[PDB]
mmCIF file of C-alpha atoms (C1' of nucleotides) and ligand atoms in Angstrom:
data_model
loop_
_atom_site.group_PDB
_atom_site.id
_atom_site.type_symbol
_atom_site.label_atom_id
_atom_site.label_comp_id
_atom_site.label_asym_id
_atom_site.label_seq_id
_atom_site.Cartn_x
_atom_site.Cartn_y
_atom_site.Cartn_z
ATOM 1 C CA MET A 1 -68.387 -15.267 8.493
ATOM 2 C CA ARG A 2 -68.524 -17.368 5.333
ATOM 3 C CA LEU A 3 -66.104 -19.667 3.569
ATOM 4 C CA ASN A 4 -65.247 -16.795 1.199
ATOM 5 C CA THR A 5 -64.834 -14.024 3.796
ATOM 6 C CA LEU A 6 -61.856 -15.224 5.889
ATOM 7 C CA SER A 7 -58.353 -13.781 5.488
ATOM 8 C CA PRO A 8 -55.019 -14.292 7.274
ATOM 9 C CA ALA A 9 -53.110 -11.820 9.429
ATOM 10 C CA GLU A 10 -50.891 -9.208 7.812
ATOM 11 C CA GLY A 11 -47.263 -10.241 7.550
ATOM 12 C CA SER A 12 -47.714 -14.009 7.795
ATOM 13 C CA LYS A 13 -47.769 -14.957 4.089
ATOM 14 C CA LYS A 14 -44.434 -13.945 2.581
ATOM 15 C CA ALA A 15 -44.028 -15.159 -0.999
ATOM 16 C CA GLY A 16 -41.092 -17.303 -2.027
ATOM 17 C CA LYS A 17 -38.174 -16.493 -4.290
ATOM 18 C CA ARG A 18 -38.362 -17.545 -7.939
ATOM 19 C CA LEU A 19 -35.086 -17.434 -9.852
ATOM 20 C CA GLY A 20 -34.501 -16.947 -13.555
ATOM 21 C CA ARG A 21 -37.805 -15.466 -14.728
ATOM 22 C CA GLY A 22 -36.811 -12.309 -16.589
ATOM 23 C CA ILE A 23 -35.031 -8.993 -16.179
ATOM 24 C CA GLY A 24 -37.738 -7.132 -14.275
ATOM 25 C CA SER A 25 -37.976 -9.573 -11.379
ATOM 26 C CA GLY A 26 -34.448 -8.775 -10.235
ATOM 27 C CA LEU A 27 -33.264 -12.397 -10.225
ATOM 28 C CA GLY A 28 -33.028 -13.414 -13.876
ATOM 29 C CA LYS A 29 -30.177 -15.049 -15.754
ATOM 30 C CA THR A 30 -27.531 -16.008 -13.190
ATOM 31 C CA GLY A 31 -30.155 -16.087 -10.429
ATOM 32 C CA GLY A 32 -28.109 -14.543 -7.634
ATOM 33 C CA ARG A 33 -24.957 -16.629 -8.115
ATOM 34 C CA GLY A 34 -22.460 -14.321 -9.846
ATOM 35 C CA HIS A 35 -20.033 -15.394 -12.595
ATOM 36 C CA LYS A 36 -18.009 -18.525 -13.276
ATOM 37 C CA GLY A 37 -16.898 -20.265 -10.096
ATOM 38 C CA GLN A 38 -17.049 -23.512 -8.190
ATOM 39 C CA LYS A 39 -19.777 -21.924 -6.041
ATOM 40 C CA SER A 40 -21.912 -21.176 -9.114
ATOM 41 C CA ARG A 41 -22.162 -24.802 -10.238
ATOM 42 C CA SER A 42 -24.944 -27.323 -9.701
ATOM 43 C CA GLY A 43 -23.830 -29.104 -6.538
ATOM 44 C CA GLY A 44 -20.905 -26.792 -5.855
ATOM 45 C CA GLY A 45 -19.448 -25.684 -2.554
ATOM 46 C CA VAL A 46 -16.967 -26.816 0.081
ATOM 47 C CA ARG A 47 -17.507 -28.949 3.164
ATOM 48 C CA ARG A 48 -17.830 -27.537 6.672
ATOM 49 C "C1'" G B 1 -22.706 -22.790 -22.783
ATOM 50 C "C1'" G B 2 -27.788 -21.539 -21.134
ATOM 51 C "C1'" U B 3 -31.269 -19.834 -17.327
ATOM 52 C "C1'" U B 4 -38.433 -17.346 -19.253
ATOM 53 C "C1'" C B 5 -43.623 -11.545 -16.218
ATOM 54 C "C1'" U B 6 -43.594 -5.955 -14.108
ATOM 55 C "C1'" C B 7 -42.572 -1.574 -11.115
ATOM 56 C "C1'" C B 8 -40.033 1.012 -6.503
ATOM 57 C "C1'" C B 9 -35.351 2.005 -2.875
ATOM 58 C "C1'" C B 10 -30.036 1.374 -1.954
ATOM 59 C "C1'" G B 11 -25.624 -0.038 -4.318
ATOM 60 C "C1'" A B 12 -19.797 -2.744 -4.826
ATOM 61 C "C1'" A B 13 -14.792 -5.248 -5.849
ATOM 62 C "C1'" A B 14 -10.894 -6.563 -9.241
ATOM 63 C "C1'" G B 15 -7.169 -5.465 -2.290
ATOM 64 C "C1'" C B 16 -4.345 -7.825 2.424
ATOM 65 C "C1'" U B 17 -3.200 -12.902 4.640
ATOM 66 C "C1'" A B 18 -2.947 -18.420 3.857
ATOM 67 C "C1'" U B 19 -3.276 -22.447 0.556
ATOM 68 C "C1'" U B 20 0.234 -29.338 -4.020
ATOM 69 C "C1'" U B 21 -2.060 -22.263 -4.271
ATOM 70 C "C1'" A B 22 -1.996 -19.097 -8.672
ATOM 71 C "C1'" G B 23 -8.644 -18.569 -14.069
ATOM 72 C "C1'" G B 24 -10.485 -22.381 -7.190
ATOM 73 C "C1'" U B 25 -11.333 -21.484 -1.950
ATOM 74 C "C1'" A B 26 -11.347 -19.509 3.305
ATOM 75 C "C1'" G B 27 -10.884 -15.131 7.363
ATOM 76 C "C1'" C B 28 -10.599 -9.771 7.028
ATOM 77 C "C1'" G B 29 -11.569 -4.784 4.013
ATOM 78 C "C1'" C B 30 -15.711 -2.905 0.610
ATOM 79 C "C1'" C B 31 -22.489 -3.664 -0.336
ATOM 80 C "C1'" U B 32 -27.551 -4.455 1.767
ATOM 81 C "C1'" C B 33 -31.564 -5.348 5.660
ATOM 82 C "C1'" G B 34 -32.836 -5.136 11.247
ATOM 83 C "C1'" U B 35 -31.872 -3.378 16.378
ATOM 84 C "C1'" G B 36 -29.258 -0.246 20.049
ATOM 85 C "C1'" A B 37 -26.178 3.621 21.568
ATOM 86 C "C1'" A B 38 -22.648 8.619 23.037
ATOM 87 C "C1'" U B 39 -21.723 15.629 20.630
ATOM 88 C "C1'" U B 40 -19.925 9.497 18.069
ATOM 89 C "C1'" C B 41 -18.167 11.518 12.934
ATOM 90 C "C1'" A B 42 -16.412 15.188 8.826
ATOM 91 C "C1'" U B 43 -14.974 20.284 7.156
ATOM 92 C "C1'" C B 44 -12.549 25.282 9.206
ATOM 93 C "C1'" U B 45 -9.971 28.335 13.216
ATOM 94 C "C1'" C B 46 -6.711 28.125 17.494
ATOM 95 C "C1'" C B 47 -3.404 25.097 20.713
ATOM 96 C "C1'" G B 48 0.230 20.663 22.121
ATOM 97 C "C1'" G B 49 3.611 17.079 19.462
ATOM 98 C "C1'" G B 50 7.324 13.649 17.043
ATOM 99 C "C1'" G B 51 9.950 13.598 12.506
ATOM 100 C "C1'" G B 52 14.787 13.545 8.711
ATOM 101 C "C1'" U B 53 11.800 13.568 2.765
ATOM 102 C "C1'" A B 54 12.447 18.221 -0.841
ATOM 103 C "C1'" G B 55 16.272 21.719 -0.724
ATOM 104 C "C1'" A B 56 21.259 22.569 1.070
ATOM 105 C "C1'" G B 57 26.149 21.209 2.878
ATOM 106 C "C1'" C B 58 31.074 18.638 3.089
ATOM 107 C "C1'" A B 59 32.905 18.233 10.376
ATOM 108 C "C1'" C B 60 32.066 12.050 9.534
ATOM 109 C "C1'" U B 61 32.037 7.345 5.495
ATOM 110 C "C1'" G B 62 33.437 7.440 0.290
ATOM 111 C "C1'" U B 63 34.812 9.925 -4.229
ATOM 112 C "C1'" U B 64 37.133 14.346 -7.197
ATOM 113 C "C1'" U B 65 40.403 18.686 -9.365
ATOM 114 C "C1'" C B 66 44.171 22.806 -8.634
ATOM 115 C "C1'" G B 67 48.188 25.387 -5.606
ATOM 116 C "C1'" G B 68 51.611 25.164 -1.340
ATOM 117 C "C1'" C B 69 54.820 22.168 2.084
ATOM 118 C "C1'" A B 70 57.058 17.654 2.167
ATOM 119 C "C1'" A B 71 57.843 12.434 4.773
ATOM 120 C "C1'" G B 72 58.477 8.696 1.746
ATOM 121 C "C1'" G B 73 59.592 6.359 -3.587
ATOM 122 C "C1'" G B 74 61.516 5.019 -8.960
ATOM 123 C "C1'" G B 75 65.702 6.073 -12.292
ATOM 124 C "C1'" G B 76 70.901 7.596 -12.208
ATOM 125 C "C1'" U B 77 76.630 10.221 -11.967
ATOM 126 C "C1'" C B 78 80.412 9.885 -8.215
ATOM 127 C "C1'" A B 79 82.546 7.100 -3.559
ATOM 128 C "C1'" U B 80 82.475 2.280 -1.506
ATOM 129 C "C1'" C B 81 84.897 -1.204 4.539
HETATM 130 MG MG1 LIG C 1 -29.573 -6.669 -10.089
HETATM 131 MG MG1 LIG C 2 -26.961 -14.397 -3.465
HETATM 132 MG MG1 LIG C 3 -22.493 -17.834 -18.136
HETATM 133 MG MG1 LIG C 4 -13.399 -14.285 -12.882
HETATM 134 MG MG1 LIG C 5 -14.319 -17.311 -9.074
HETATM 135 MG MG1 LIG C 6 -18.061 -16.716 -6.931
HETATM 136 MG MG1 LIG C 7 -24.142 -19.827 -13.517
HETATM 137 MG MG1 LIG C 8 -22.289 -28.070 -13.116
HETATM 138 MG MG1 LIG C 9 -23.953 -32.752 -11.190
HETATM 139 MG MG1 LIG C 10 -26.011 -16.999 -20.592
HETATM 140 MG MG1 LIG C 11 -27.850 6.317 -6.003
HETATM 141 MG MG1 LIG C 12 -13.128 -0.084 -7.784
HETATM 142 MG MG1 LIG C 13 -12.583 -19.736 -14.120
HETATM 143 MG MG1 LIG C 14 -8.543 -23.655 -10.355
HETATM 144 MG MG1 LIG C 15 -19.460 -4.843 -1.496
HETATM 145 MG MG1 LIG C 16 -27.536 0.230 9.075
HETATM 146 MG MG1 LIG C 17 -15.747 18.358 14.467
HETATM 147 MG MG1 LIG C 18 9.796 19.799 15.533
HETATM 148 MG MG1 LIG C 19 18.966 15.752 -2.622
HETATM 149 MG MG1 LIG C 20 33.582 14.735 2.620
HETATM 150 MG MG1 LIG C 21 47.858 18.075 -4.095
#
RNA sequence: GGUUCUCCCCGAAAGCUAUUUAGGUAGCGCCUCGUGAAUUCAUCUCCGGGGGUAGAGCACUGUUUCGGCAAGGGGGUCAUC
């Protein structure tokens, strides 16, 4: 064991979602929000 | 209005209900991922059902033409208590 020979367990290091970074990533442009609503706006949504 | 690298798998809706609601939103229908479960599901053959649409008809509710019979009407001549 050395400082450059340790690795984590498989399945514990899921990567986060990054929106709006091109066509190929699957989340570009609208970034998962759809088209033209109150829910698509910055800060938008209704109270509980 | 705009939203920046790549490949693989699956894949919609533009409907119902409510709303100072109608180009917004919420529950349900429709997509995706995970888990569990029954011959659970679809096509065809045979069997058991209810029906009142298409068509037709004129006993009923309405409407329509011709012939017969004729109550009952309208117009009169004569008589008039
Ligand atoms: Mg996409
Ligand atoms: Mg989303
Ligand atoms: Mg836009
Ligand atoms: Mg729209
Ligand atoms: Mg909208
Ligand atoms: Mg929306
Ligand atoms: Mg947007
Ligand atoms: Mg905004
Ligand atoms: Mg703001
Ligand atoms: Mg744009
Ligand atoms: Mg496909
Ligand atoms: Mg459609
Ligand atoms: Mg709009
Ligand atoms: Mg609005
Ligand atoms: Mg869907
Ligand atoms: Mg499934
Ligand atoms: Mg079967
Ligand atoms: Mg029958
Ligand atoms: Mg008929
Ligand atoms: Mg009849
Ligand atoms: Mg007759």
